[PDB]
Curated annotation (Swiss-Prot), chains A, B, C, D:
Protein name as annotated: Galactose-binding lectin
Chain's role: D-galactose specific lectin.
Shown stretch of the complete protein: 24 to 255 of 273
Effect of residue 162 to I: In minor form
Miscellaneous: Binds one manganese (or another transition metal) ion and one calcium ion. The metal ions are essential for the saccharide-binding and cell-agglutinating activities.
Family: Belongs to the leguminous lectin family.
Outcome following mutation: residue 92 to V: In minor form
């Protein structure tokens, strides 16, 4: 089998294993800060630099994967704590959408909320234009920030959040477990056919955005990943 | 919400938080050893002593859970490396089946392979009587060691194996990710309705067994768990 | 710290983690075959596709690394069993030298034997033009196939050879242990300053070559690697 | 060429291939447990029972060696996690020092920290009396627990640690690569003249110790070794 495996306990500028897009910076403590607090419609994204072959047009086989990551969102004075973080999967050529308005697009979609990606969003602002639920939520996204499914959640300012994601290729199930600061777990799961929605070669990563009035600290603290694709 | 949370980095026999059944021992290094290498049809099981409420007859709500554990199976001289370990969920009064033959029953079922439990098995011996696949496998079990579903796997002697399990109550999906020695990940997922198959209060644990000619070292190294049941 | 880790138990065409250069083919059993047995001056090379940051111009720190691989060289009828395999480190833009004569150049150097690379060679033909010792040898190469140091060795046709390499950044020591078919070990070690000889970002890989009369089967069976760079 | 080669995937009490010294026990899972958790100044050691000819008095030749082993250190309640494990080389008659205080001596030296041995220590307690660095470390020891050289390291409780050691006789270089749980590699290398510091035949092994307050689980899980001495 063909396996991609990596582990990030911290990050650094100049690591060729990571692609930095837009307003991303690396802090002295090793955290990735995705948005620029002094910029309007800030968008920042980090991708694992090596494309991952999630399915093969030759065999028809689809990869399974296990990934864990930790993040932190923290309020800043005067601005609305917005807009959130999205763990996403997209074609290997993926770039921040041209003329991105940031905000509710989470740096992955156009103004209408459409894009070419699969993702798990940690949404901290209710955008009526994307049919967002009224509270903070975890959502499963398939080519749109108008989520296929959401679950109520609570983004606590300054809290370290732990996420575990399992994609089971045979059932096409994307399962997510979110470990909150109050000790409770939040789960969400959805059948998503990655072979039907995405090309063979993809990139994995994180994106976050803000607006003129909606800004917060978006931090990626750690990321581990393993994908395995059965080969002929 | 109602949350049960625990973490075992090590295990000890004086700790009332675990119930010990059958031939199980705790080694001085802190590991749980489920079977006795010198006994015919050895069966050893371990359960978290406190019953966990997984669903409510009042609200109809079912808990979600995230659990991770690590185990090790190691070959012993002159014996077939058998039979395997099962992570299981059973009614709170669960006991080793009376007159257990161990072996392919994995200490949770009768001779016909039937029992009252939901489990994830790490099977290392092909029992034709339980329609086992020809190789080592991970199976999702619902009241039978004749698995609802299996996935090929490889039990590497002396390797530390890491497992992550997500149960998403809304989709009723039990998703499993197993991290092997060769670096590959193996996943298996199955829709299992816990309300329909198990009582409101259950015990979680591990079981392993052997036969006259089938024996191996079965070890539980660590276990973390979090369940959350919505009470509104 | 910044760590790069990978493990290849087998190889496949289409794996984005591997760059194929020249006459390389992947066999149905998963082995990489580096040279074409029917081509004059055949050269084949495989590289890990991601550039590896081996030193930082910001901190002055140099990475340490541990790598293991298994290869096989097998005689073919009538041709001289030549020329061997080189495990090498080179600038990220590395290509087979233009107008390569293959042969004693091992696909990494020009006709005079000069190139931009650091390598461990498994040399099976004595090239007087590169001051080769009279027998098969393991050599440490610094920008030349005229080795800084060599040790007598024996390339056994059809034998699986295991190699372990340690690069200790603090002492700048490259240490090699070669495990033969007859059970004996061969070692060679050399102080090589990678920060002085190579750029910050590099590619790691394997190269092999042949000539008109010098041809043999050159196989790469497995490859594991871990590098760690202290960050500040 | 005179070669010594062995492989231990597990260990057993009834095997004359290993010499057991002091408080050492074999657990039912096959691991060697070096210290007794209920004893003051506990010292336990294991040696490969056959002496290894590391050098010739006839030719003046010195052996090269390649060795790999895996170990585990685990914290125990109410005791300081101390003192660590040493992989050592000593005269064939080597015994635990008479009236050993255990602790910082690592079971290989006297109260002043002096002994007759060459070793690689995995030291988890800072002994100012042996000029230990302030954190956990890997050290290269020559007749003293006051290390010739150290490198900062981190002993993770319950983690399986893999070590690879290369001794290159021509450069007299002892190179060590330590693979941690967080994925990082730690290396240390030192020129050590084995012919000048040790006798013709030596014993290879492992030692660990504790004190009244400093105690932890010290486990040896596996050990492979190959040495080759050129006889021509
Ligand atoms: O000061 C106070 C009271 C302070 C306070 O805490 N008061 C508390 O009151 C309590 C009881 O109420 C208690 O008494 C308590 O003791 C007391 O302390 N209010 C007055 C007040 C404060 N802002 C803030 C909050 O919301 C406004 C303003 O600052 C940011 C935000 N904005 C509004 C706008 C206007 N553009 C637009 O609507 C067009 C574009 C637009 O909305 N894009 C969206 O902007 C979002 C962010 O708002 C997202 O990023 C979206 O994704 C993005 O699409 N752009 N940015 N607006 N009005
Ligand atoms: O020696 C060799 C070849 C060894 C070898 O390495 N050969 C190598 O081959 C190489 C090339 O291939 C090379 O040539 C190499 O040079 C050469 O060394 N075979 C001859 C041989 C060896 N056993 C072993 C393996 O299987 C047998 C025997 O030892 C264990 C097992 N059992 C079972 C019994 C007693 N029954 C019963 O209890 C009957 C009921 C029964 O089968 N319950 C099941 O028993 C299982 C375990 O077998 C499971 O636990 C099941 O869950 C359980 O239901 N009693 N024993 N049986 N026959
Ligand atoms: O048949 C036998 C004895 C066989 C045998 O088993 N004899 C046994 O002896 C026993 C007792 O000892 C018993 O009596 C037994 O009964 C008897 O059977 N020799 C007569 C004989 C055989 N070739 C062979 C070996 O070497 C020659 C020939 O086949 C291959 C090679 N090449 C080379 C060429 C074309 N040049 C060039 O390309 C010139 C440039 C050149 O030399 N580049 C180098 O070529 C190398 C490869 O040779 C390397 O690849 C170098 O890196 C490369 O730089 N074209 N060919 N040349 N002459
Ligand atoms: O409880 C606490 C804080 C616990 C804690 O978690 N605090 C947390 O702090 C957090 C924020 O920081 C939070 O606030 C949190 O809420 C709070 O819980 N300290 C008070 C405290 C605890 N021991 C421990 C640690 O060190 C002592 C004690 O237990 C073991 C050790 N020993 C030693 C002895 C007996 N001597 C001798 O034998 C003298 C000779 C001696 O020192 N040979 C050396 O002993 C070593 C081992 O200590 C090595 O083995 C050396 O190789 C050996 O040479 N007898 N005992 N000594 N003093
Ligand atoms: Ca939103
Ligand atoms: Ca040559
Ligand atoms: Ca110490
Ligand atoms: Mn949303
Ligand atoms: Mn050469
Ligand atoms: Mn020390």
């Amino acid at each position: 089998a063909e396996t991609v495996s990596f582990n990030f306990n911290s990050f650094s500028e100049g690591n060729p294993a990571i692609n930095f897009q837009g307003d991303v910076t690396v802090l002295s403590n090793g955290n990735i800060q995705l948005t620029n607090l002094n910029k309007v419609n800030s968008v920042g994204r980090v991708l694992y630099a090596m494309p991952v072959r999630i399915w093969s047009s030759a065999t028809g086989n689809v990869a399974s994967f296990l990934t864990s990551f930790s993040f932190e969102m923290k309020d800043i004075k005067d601005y609305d704590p917005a807009d959130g973080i999205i763990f996403f999967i997209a074609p290997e050529d993926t770039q921040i959408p041209a003329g991105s308005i940031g905000g509710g697009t989470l740096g992955v979609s156009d103004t209408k909320g459409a894009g070419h990606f699969v993702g798990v969003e940690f949404d901290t602002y209710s955008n009526s234009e994307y049919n967002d639920p009224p509270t903070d939520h975890v959502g499963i996204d398939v080519n749109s920030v108008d989520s296929v499914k959401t679950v109520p959640w609570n983004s606590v300012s300054g809290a370290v959040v732990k996420v575990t994601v399992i994609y089971d290729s045979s059932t096409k199930t994307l399962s997510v477990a979110v470990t909150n600061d109050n000790g409770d777990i939040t789960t969400i799961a959805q059948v998503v056919d990655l072979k039907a929605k995405l090309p063979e070669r993809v990139k994995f990563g994180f994106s976050a955005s803000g607006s003129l009035g909606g800004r917060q600290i978006h931090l990626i603290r750690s990321w581990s990943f393993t994908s395995t694709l059965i080969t002929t």
